[PDB]
Design an enzyme around this catalytic site. Structure first.
Site, PDB file in Angstrom:
ATOM      1  CB  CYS A 196      -2.502   1.178  -3.077  1.00  0.00           C
ATOM      2  SG  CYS A 196      -2.630   2.922  -3.570  1.00  0.00           S
ATOM      3  CG  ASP A 216      -1.883   1.208   1.186  1.00  0.00           C
ATOM      4  OD1 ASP A 216      -2.565   1.420   0.156  1.00  0.00           O
ATOM      5  OD2 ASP A 216      -1.918   1.948   2.191  1.00  0.00           O
ATOM      6  CB  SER A 217       0.177   4.723  -0.937  1.00  0.00           C
ATOM      7  OG  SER A 217      -1.059   4.839  -0.257  1.00  0.00           O
ATOM      8  CB  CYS A 221     -10.103   5.455  -1.742  1.00  0.00           C
ATOM      9  SG  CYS A 221      -8.719   6.216  -0.865  1.00  0.00           S
ATOM     10  CG  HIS A 262      -7.306   6.400   3.419  1.00  0.00           C
ATOM     11  ND1 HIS A 262      -6.475   5.643   2.624  1.00  0.00           N
ATOM     12  CD2 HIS A 262      -6.499   7.191   4.164  1.00  0.00           C
ATOM     13  CE1 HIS A 262      -5.219   5.948   2.894  1.00  0.00           C
ATOM     14  NE2 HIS A 262      -5.206   6.885   3.824  1.00  0.00           N
ATOM     15  CD  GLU A 303      -2.953   9.132   5.478  1.00  0.00           C
ATOM     16  OE1 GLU A 303      -1.856   9.503   5.950  1.00  0.00           O
ATOM     17  OE2 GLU A 303      -3.121   8.864   4.271  1.00  0.00           O
TER      18      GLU A 303
HETATM   19  N1  LIG Z   1      -3.982   3.974  -0.842  1.00  0.00           N
HETATM   20  C1  LIG Z   1      -4.583   4.942  -1.754  1.00  0.00           C
HETATM   21  C2  LIG Z   1      -5.047   6.176  -0.985  1.00  0.00           C
HETATM   22  C3  LIG Z   1      -3.913   6.976  -0.373  1.00  0.00           C
HETATM   23  C4  LIG Z   1      -2.983   7.545  -1.425  1.00  0.00           C
HETATM   24  O1  LIG Z   1      -3.437   8.386  -2.231  1.00  0.00           O
HETATM   25  O2  LIG Z   1      -1.803   7.136  -1.456  1.00  0.00           O
HETATM   26  C5  LIG Z   1      -5.758   4.329  -2.500  1.00  0.00           C
HETATM   27  O3  LIG Z   1      -6.191   3.213  -2.195  1.00  0.00           O
HETATM   28  O4  LIG Z   1      -6.304   4.939  -3.421  1.00  0.00           O
END
Ligand SMILES: N[C@H](CCC(=O)O)C(=O)O
Ligand SMILES: Cc1nc(-c2ccncc2)sc1CN
Ligand SMILES: Cc1nc(-c2ccncc2)sc1CN
Ligand SMILES: N[C@H](CCC(=O)O)C(=O)O
Ligand SMILES: [Cl-]
Lengths: 255, 255
Positions: B71, B8-9, B182, B184, B151
């Site tokens: 992600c 993940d990011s 997404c 989040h 976050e």
């Molecule tokens: N993990 C990213 C969201 C956070 C980011 O933009 O890095 C997603 O699932 O889209």
């Protein structure tokens, strides 16, 4: 007093354009190499170790450009990485924190005046501004991490209920009514009037602008004449898409 | 198969990890969040594509047999390039969500709203995948500010409500299904349901598609894994930023 033409400006992204605007308006330098770490922005939500390393890698970027002075436009890198950047580089590095302290000394003769520091989480958790102000004898300094202003400002949200609500969220808990308000983040100059208008409408303060403060400091330290280059040359570099960053510069610099 | 990687990011991928742990289908999980460079969603496809390839280098010494790209942004932009340079299977969270919709949304004309980052929405990966399956009534909405809000642990209150009102008031199609495209957005899933219930007077909320739940079903069926097998899977956390910081967020996100 010192001598010092080709300048570097380092920022985490497009926020540093608020510092570039001050530099360009002062017309003190003829060549500026701007580098925004737009692949990794924001810095303010990350940890000192990561940020210090980012600052050191920014030095590696500038080494082939034979700059004579590096401005760290980023208040977060300034607060967390400046000392490490200074030790690992053979060229002068000027951050945007120390210049704002000097500006306050010159503009705030009441050493008891309430001061309010606004910045990223990383900047505020470093206590960089508090320590430097205390060292200069100021005794009533509060700080506030307004993290969400950065992404709000980058989405061009400069007015409206979403900006007003975000200010309410962060400012409402404040105890002391400030007489000075340090914009300790590259982004916050773009909402300076709203921040002034909030503290006045929910109770103006002396707003310290990081770009204006670093410009004034450089004139004194290096004896630099204004209006000495009518069209400075600015080159833009980015870790992300440079075209995206140059397009943002067009917006940020005509503002 | 047995030892998997999760990429993940940053900490958003914990929403997918939470789904994986609840299903108890893997014994060993290597989670890697690129927390030094998060977010990806505000950045450009070239940068994000390169981020995905570099993530593959991280997992090489870990000898994983499967990499989950939790992600949605990396899934939308980097999955294909990642797969070309990889000897192991890579599974993103986009394609499994299409299958969950195919399974839960028999009315191909049902209005569907895809929510995600600007990069995810700009890629049109969801719209293209949905069109490919006969779904004609499809809208996409970049809700960039949800990521930094979540976050900052702003999962409720007036600031979040104003932000939803900012993004949703422009909607023309009252959706029957909302894809949480997404990592989040699950953390505000009930809030998103609550918003539509209030501002459009409904009795039952839209169907919410959770990316993590979608990929779990997909993976259990694809590798025929026994749910509730490993009662305490092994999870290793790695980050490009401070791994202690990422592990602390994990505790909160996985609760
Ligand atoms: N993990 C990213 C969201 C956070 C980011 O933009 O890095 C997603 O699932 O889209
Ligand atoms: C005032 C201003 N100055 C710009 C500039 C200067 C030097 N090099 C590149 C761009 S753009 C602009 C308005 N957007
Ligand atoms: C709060 C929580 N933390 C979990 C965890 C953490 C680290 N490694 C494996 C599992 S599961 C869970 C709740 N279901
Ligand atoms: N340049 C940063 C703001 C954006 C970021 O978080 O990187 C600063 O001045 O603090
Ligand atoms: Cl690009």
């Amino acid at each position: 007093p010192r001598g010092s033409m080709k300048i570097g400006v380092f920022d985490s992204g497009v926020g540093g354009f608020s510092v570039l605007k001050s530099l360009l308006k002062a017309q003190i330098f003829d060549k500026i190499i701007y580098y925004g770490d737009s692949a990794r922005v924001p810095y303010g939500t990350k940890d000192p170790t990561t940020i210090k390393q980012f600052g050191l890698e920014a030095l590696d970027f500038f080494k082939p450009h034979k700059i004579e002075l590096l401005i760290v436009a980023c208040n977060t890198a300034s607060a967390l990485a400046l000392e490490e950047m200074q030790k690992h580089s053979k060229i002068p590095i000027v951050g945007v924190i120390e210049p704002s302290i000097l500006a306050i000394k010159q503009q705030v003769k009441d050493k008891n005046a309430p001061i309010l520091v606004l910045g990223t989480k990383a900047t505020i958790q470093s206590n960089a501004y508090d320590n430097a102000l205390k060292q200069q004898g100021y005794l009533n300094v509060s700080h506030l991490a307004t993290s969400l202003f950065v992404p709000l400002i980058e989405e061009n949200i400069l007015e409206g209920e979403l900006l007003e609500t975000c200010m309410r969220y962060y400012f409402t808990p404040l105890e002391i009514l400030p007489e000075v308000v340090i914009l300790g983040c590259t982004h916050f100059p773009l909402i300076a009037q709203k921040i002034e208008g909030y503290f006045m409408e929910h109770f103006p303060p002396l707003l310290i602008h990081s770009g204006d403060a670093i410009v004034e400091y450089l004139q004194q330290k290096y004896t630099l004449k204004k209006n000495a280059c009518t069209f400075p040359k600015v080159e833009f570099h980015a870790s992300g898409d440079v075209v995206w960053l140059e397009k943002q510069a067009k917006e940020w610099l005509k503002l």
